[PDB]
């Protein structure tokens, strides 16, 4: 075979790009798409389009626009620039509104610089933005803004935006604003991190900064004081320049106010009904409140009889947090994915007045998410097809008869497509299907009335042609049994794989709670190069604690992090080493974050199964990690709760067992998520027991070590390491 293999440079340089097709539904019949660089509008039914905005309309803007956002009515466009990243979702920027009618950019009453967040109303073109931790509203882009809040105070009071832990572990967003459907009310949360300790670390910046700066971020570690939260709703239709806006507060339920708790979900049901979910610090009990607007009193009332309790006796509630409800048109009922009697996550139908929900789906498989709802059907994605937890398809169930379930993606192209995600238009008149594996990504448009296939948006013909000139590796998805249970794994096999030969093996690991490293998704990554060029087999295993297979597996590691998930990887390796094509003398292991944790716990387990391992930004001791994520699985690190296990699941305690393995520890000094502190403590422990090891720190890089240069440098360094570790002497 004279074809080139997939090299490290291809991965690092993106020599082979997967074409995408990111669209944005602006109605039930049209969607926006970024062609060349200008914006076009498409009619889903025919495929014809028109330019919605010339890629040259802002040639002399005098600023590079980071991103845009058209108002719902297509009347305005919010140009974002001066982008400056903060954590995973947060960031600041400067904004400018450009009237699409007058074809002139508004120069009056502009959004302030260093705006923390902005958002159009769902309908029309109102604006709500957060500045210096306060909320403002603009009924018209060129009119003054109303200041909705006055308590904003950096690192203390957040209004409309999340603090560090809420953004990363609860909302996966920086936004803490929620417009009501027609945009009348603006619901927002308020966080107070007054007593939350600050994580502190150095930032060196450019070489010209003489003194390094100390970054201080309110971050609650396991057991520390968490931020507190309040909810509010304000009417934007009745705001005045004279008096200040009045926000009506909706206090949490009594079962929540008896101790620490979190706001974990906000969802409008109708124009005057809002539902909220609260979660106790001990995350196995949550309650939903449904609040109706009292047009007379002007206040919001949430009738007890409308409260819905959700709790688990075997673990935490929900996959990472209680699922979102999907209300019906009238808002009188709703569907919500909850764990069932047998511990499998399915869709349950709820009446806001009745307390017993009804399951409309069942079986030893799970519903990943509810994607769309009509009076006749509910569309969702699950891993039911062929009973493969790693696969995903679009299904729809008839609401009048649950026995009638129809898969809409299963048979489209079975050999190429086994993992879809979907995108429906405003009224579910149309939907885009996105297939991401096992073969190359495929995007298609469909109509709901007859579930007919309209057309192909992107099939990646190009990439496919070039990939043909390459010796691409293959992927094997399968399972092994452990104690009657079925656990899945996948192997990235080198080209021209020969079962008579023996290859070294690299166990790519994550294994966090509800994780899944064994799926049918097609990926171009480091593993791709290792198998294509170094002829290294890259495997992954989903053991206990893994997700999408029911709580018996997922909850297996409840209050016991660092046990079964770590054991199962070892047992997984142990079994792969027993296979004919694996060289038991050359088996490595690596992970990032939780994978780093697991990778380290495995190397210090004393199993003798692994020769070397690489841990990138690993967690080393749970009391070092954040409260919301750690406590969810571990509980509180108090003597009367689970402190003992907190102290027994550290990497440090296993230092000596590293004497017989080659270890490479990497971490960014500016990691605000998994603090460098965790790696510094791992290293000190190894030094304490005299174990040599490899290390690499990245100045000013954070948890993702994603800067262009750092990204290439870390993968290059790790590659040298794995290569040296597998070098046949």
Ligand X SMILES: *[C@@H]1O[C@H](CO)[C@@H](O)[C@H](O)[C@H]1NC(C)=O
Active site residues: 593, 671, 703
What residue ranges bind ligand X (CB under 6 A)? 41, 43, 46, 48-50, 150-151, 157, 182, 184, 192, 194-195, 244, 271-272, 282, 284-285, 311, 313, 635
> In whole angstroms, how close is the CB of 523 to its own copies at the nearest point?
24
> In whole angstroms, how close is the CB of 292 to ligand X at the nearest point?
11
CB nearer to its own copies: give 582 or 636: 636
Q: How far is CA 57 from CA 17, 78, 92, 105, 423, in A?
A: 28, 14, 24, 11, 29
> In whole angstroms, how close is the CB of 228 to ligand X at the nearest point?
6
Residue choice 552, 699, 706, 723 for contact with its own copies (CB under 8 A): 699
- Among candidate residues 239, 236, 233, the one with its CA nearest the CA of residue 266: 233
CB nearer to ligand X: give 76 or 658: 76
Cβ neighbours around 687 below 10 Å, total: 12
> In whole angstroms, how close is the CB of 167 to its own copies at the nearest point?
20
How much helix, strand and coil, in percent to the nearest 5, is found in the chain? Answer: 15, 35, 45
DSSP structure string for 64-115: -EEE--B-TTSSEEEEEEEEEE-SSS-EEEEEEEEETTTTEE--SSPPPSSE
CB nearer to its own copies: give 26 or 652: 652
Per CB under 8 A, the segment of 185-193, 477-485, 522-530, 695-703 that binds its own copies is: 695-703
- Is 109 a residue that touches its own copies (CB under 8 A)? no
Residue choice 51, 254, 687, 706 for contact with its own copies (CB under 8 A): 687
CB nearer to its own copies: give 93 or 603: 603
| Phi, psi angle pair for 146, to nearest 5° | -95, 135
In sign, the C-alpha dihedral spanning 150, 154, 156, 161 is positive
Burial 644-678 (b: 16+ CB within 10 A, else e): ebbeebbbbebbebbeebbbbbbbbbbbbbbbbbb
Report the C-alpha gap between 120 and 237 in whole angstroms.
15
In sign, the C-alpha dihedral spanning 316, 319, 320, 325 is negative
* Residues 73, 81 contacting (CB under 8 angstroms): no
Cβ neighbours around 455 below 10 Å, total: 11
Cα–Cα–Cα angle for 337, 342, 347, rounded to 5 degrees: 20
Select from its own copies, ligand X, none the partner in contact with residue 159, using the beta carbon and a kind-dependent cut-off of 5 to 8 Å: none
- Is 690 a residue that touches its own copies (CB under 8 A)? yes
> In whole angstroms, how close is the CB of 641 to its own copies at the nearest point?
16
Select from its own copies, ligand X, none the partner in contact with residue 690, using the beta carbon and a kind-dependent cut-off of 5 to 8 Å: its own copies
> In whole angstroms, how close is the CB of 381 to ligand X at the nearest point?
29
CB nearer to ligand X: give 513 or 635: 635
Select from its own copies, ligand X, none the partner in contact with residue 698, using the beta carbon and a kind-dependent cut-off of 5 to 8 Å: its own copies
Segment (H or E) for 599: helix 594-603
Select from its own copies, ligand X, none the partner in contact with residue 475, using the beta carbon and a kind-dependent cut-off of 5 to 8 Å: none
Q: SS3 for 201?
A: strand
Alpha helices in 312-386 (DSSP H): none
Residue ranges in 359-378 that form contacts with its own copies under rule CB under 8 A: none
> In whole angstroms, how close is the CB of 557 to ligand X at the nearest point?
14
Residue ranges in 224-243 that form contacts with its own copies under rule CB under 8 A: 224
| Phi, psi angle pair for 719, to nearest 5° | -60, -50
Q: Which two tokens stand for residue 103?
A: 């074809």
Cα–Cα–Cα angle for 698, 699, 705, rounded to 5 degrees: 45
Q: Binders of its own copies: how many residues, by CB under 8 A?
A: 50
On the CB side of 217, CA atoms within 13 Å amount to 20
Q: How many residues does the chain have?
A: 729
Place of tokens 């049901």: 269
| Phi, psi angle pair for 43, to nearest 5° | -100, 110
Select from ligand X, its own copies, none the partner in contact with residue 282, using the beta carbon and a kind-dependent cut-off of 5 to 8 Å: ligand X
- Is 48 a residue that touches its own copies (CB under 8 A)? no
In sign, the C-alpha dihedral spanning 132, 136, 141, 144 is negative
CB nearer to its own copies: give 314 or 724: 724
CB nearer to ligand X: give 294 or 692: 294
Select from ligand X, its own copies, none the partner in contact with residue 43, using the beta carbon and a kind-dependent cut-off of 5 to 8 Å: ligand X
x/- mask, its own copies, residues 608-647, rule CB under 8 A, reads -------------x-xx-----------------------
CB nearer to its own copies: give 377 or 629: 629
Q: How far is CA 448 from CA 45, 380, 428, 459, 483, in A?
A: 11, 13, 7, 21, 44
Select from ligand X, its own copies, none the partner in contact with residue 211, using the beta carbon and a kind-dependent cut-off of 5 to 8 Å: its own copies
Burial 224-250 (b: 16+ CB within 10 A, else e): eebbbbbbbbbbbeebeeeeebebbeb
- Is 709 a residue that touches its own copies (CB under 8 A)? yes
- Is 180 a residue that touches its own copies (CB under 8 A)? no
> In whole angstroms, how close is the CB of 428 to ligand X at the nearest point?
20
> In whole angstroms, how close is the CB of 49 to ligand X at the nearest point?
5
CB nearer to its own copies: give 155 or 700: 700
Report the C-alpha gap between 359 and 366 in whole angstroms.
12
For 7, counting Cβ atoms within 10 Å of its Cβ (0-12 exposed, 13-18 middle, 19+ buried), the class is middle
Report the C-alpha gap between 334 and 500 in whole angstroms.
56
- Is 680 a residue that touches its own copies (CB under 8 A)? yes
Select from ligand X, its own copies, none the partner in contact with residue 635, using the beta carbon and a kind-dependent cut-off of 5 to 8 Å: ligand X
> In whole angstroms, how close is the CB of 83 to its own copies at the nearest point?
21
Select from its own copies, ligand X, none the partner in contact with residue 50, using the beta carbon and a kind-dependent cut-off of 5 to 8 Å: ligand X
Peptide bond into 232 cis (omega under 30): no
CB nearer to its own copies: give 423 or 669: 669
> In whole angstroms, how close is the CB of 167 to ligand X at the nearest point?
19
CB nearer to ligand X: give 2 or 50: 50
Select from ligand X, its own copies, none the partner in contact with residue 192, using the beta carbon and a kind-dependent cut-off of 5 to 8 Å: ligand X
x/- mask, its own copies, residues 190-219, rule CB under 8 A, reads -------xxxxxx-x--x--xxxxx-----
Select from its own copies, ligand X, none the partner in contact with residue 55, using the beta carbon and a kind-dependent cut-off of 5 to 8 Å: none
> In whole angstroms, how close is the CB of 624 to its own copies at the nearest point?
7
- Among candidate residues 653, 644, 650, the one with its CA nearest the CA of residue 678: 650
Select from ligand X, its own copies, none the partner in contact with residue 195, using the beta carbon and a kind-dependent cut-off of 5 to 8 Å: ligand X
CB nearer to its own copies: give 267 or 669: 669
* E strands present in 314-451: 326-327, 333-339, 345-351, 358-359, 367-373, 377-382, 393-398, 405-407, 420-424, 430-435, 442-447
Chain contacts with its own copies (rule: CB under 8 A) = 197-202, 204, 207, 210-214, 221-224, 621, 623-624, 650, 652, 669, 675-677, 680-681, 683-685, 687-690, 692, 694-700, 709-710, 712-713, 716-717, 720
């Amino acid at each position: 075979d004279s074809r080139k293999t997939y090299t490290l440079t291809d991965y690092l340089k993106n020599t082979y790009r997967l074409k995408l097709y990111s669209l944005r539904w602006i109605s039930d019949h049209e969607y926006l798409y970024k062609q060349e660089n200008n914006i076009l509008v498409f009619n889903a039914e025919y495929g014809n389009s028109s330019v919605f905005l010339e890629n040259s309309t802002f040639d002399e803007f005098g600023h590079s626009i980071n991103d845009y956002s058209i108002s719902p009515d297509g009347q305005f466009i919010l140009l974002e620039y001066n982008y400056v990243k903060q954590w995973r979702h947060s960031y600041t920027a400067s904004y400018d509104i450009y009237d699409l009618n007058k074809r002139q950019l508004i120069t009056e009453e502009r959004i302030p610089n260093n705006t923390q967040w902005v958002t159009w109303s769902p309908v029309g073109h109102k604006l709500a933005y957060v500045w210096n931790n306060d909320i403002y509203v603009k009924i018209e882009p060129n009119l003054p803004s109303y200041r909705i809040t006055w308590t904003g105070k950096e690192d203390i009071i957040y209004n409309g935006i999340t603090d560090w832990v809420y953004e990363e572990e609860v909302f996966s967003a920086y936004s803490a604003l929620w417009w009501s459907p027609n945009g009348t009310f603006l619901a927002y949360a308020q966080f107070n991190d007054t007593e939350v300790p600050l994580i502190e670390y150095s930032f060196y910046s450019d070489e010209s900064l003489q003194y390094p700066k100390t970054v201080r971020v309110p971050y609650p570690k396991a057991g520390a004081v968490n931020p507190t939260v309040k909810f509010f709703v304000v009417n934007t239709d009745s705001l005045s320049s004279v008096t200040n806006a009045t926000s009506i507060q909706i206090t949490a339920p009594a079962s929540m106010l008896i101790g620490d708790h979190y706001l974990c979900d906000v969802t409008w049901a109708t124009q005057e009904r809002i539902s909220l979910q609260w979660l106790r610090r001990i995350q196995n009990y949550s309650v939903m409140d449904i609040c109706d607007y009292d047009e007379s009193s002007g206040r919001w009332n949430c009738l007890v009889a409308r409260q819905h309790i959700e709790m688990s006796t075997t673990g935490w509630v929900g996959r990472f947090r209680p699922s979102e409800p999907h209300f019906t048109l009238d808002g009188n009922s709703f569907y919500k994915i909850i764990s069932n009697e047998e511990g499998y996550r399915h869709i349950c139908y709820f009446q806001i007045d009745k307390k017993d929900c009804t399951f409309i789906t069942k079986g030893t498989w799970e519903v990943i998410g509810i994607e769309a709802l009509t009076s006749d059907y509910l569309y969702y994605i699950s891993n039911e097809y062929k009973g493969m937890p790693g696969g995903r398809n679009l299904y729809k169930i008839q609401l009048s008869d649950y026995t009638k379930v129809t898969c809409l993606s299963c048979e489209l192209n079975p050999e190429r497509c086994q993992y879809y995600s979907v995108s429906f238009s405003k009224e579910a008149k149309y939907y885009q299907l996105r297939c991401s594996g096992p073969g190359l990504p495929l995007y298609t448009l469909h109509s709901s009335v007859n579930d007919k296939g309209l057309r192909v948006l992107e099939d990646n013909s190009a990439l496919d042609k070039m990939l043909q000139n390459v010796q691409m590796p293959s992927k094997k998805l399968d399972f092994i049994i452990l104690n009657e249970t079925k656990f899945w794994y996948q192997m990235i096999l080198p080209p021209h794989f020969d079962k008579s030969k023996k290859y070294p093996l690299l166990l790519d690991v994550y294994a966090g709670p509800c994780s899944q490293k064994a799926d049918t998704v097609f990926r171009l990554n480091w593993a791709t190069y290792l198998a294509s060029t170094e002829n290294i087999i890259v495997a992954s295993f989903d053991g206990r604690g893994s997700g999408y297979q029911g709580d018996k597996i997922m909850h297996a590691i409840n209050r016991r992090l660092g046990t079964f998930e770590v054991e199962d990887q070892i047992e997984a390796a142990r079994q792969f080493s027993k296979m004919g094509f694996v060289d038991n003398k050359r088996i490595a292991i690596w992970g990032w974050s939780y994978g780093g944790y697991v990778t380290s716990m495995v190397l210090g387990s004393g199993s003798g199964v692994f020769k070397c391992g690489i841990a990138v930004a690993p967690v080393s001791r749970w009391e070092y990690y954040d409260s919301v994520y750690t406590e969810r699985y571990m509980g509180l690190p108090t003597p009367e709760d689970n402190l003992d296990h907190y102290r027994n699941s550290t990497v440090m305690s296993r230092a000596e067992n590293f004497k017989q393995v080659e270890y490479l520890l990497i971490h960014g000094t500016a990691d605000d998520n998994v603090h460098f502190q965790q790696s510094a403590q791992i290293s000190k422990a190894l030094v304490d027991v005299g174990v040599d090891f490899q290390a690499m720190w990245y100045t000013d890089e954070d948890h993702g070590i994603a800067s262009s240069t750092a990204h290439q440098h870390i993968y290059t360094h790790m590659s040298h390491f794995i290569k040296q570790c597998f070098s046949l002497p």
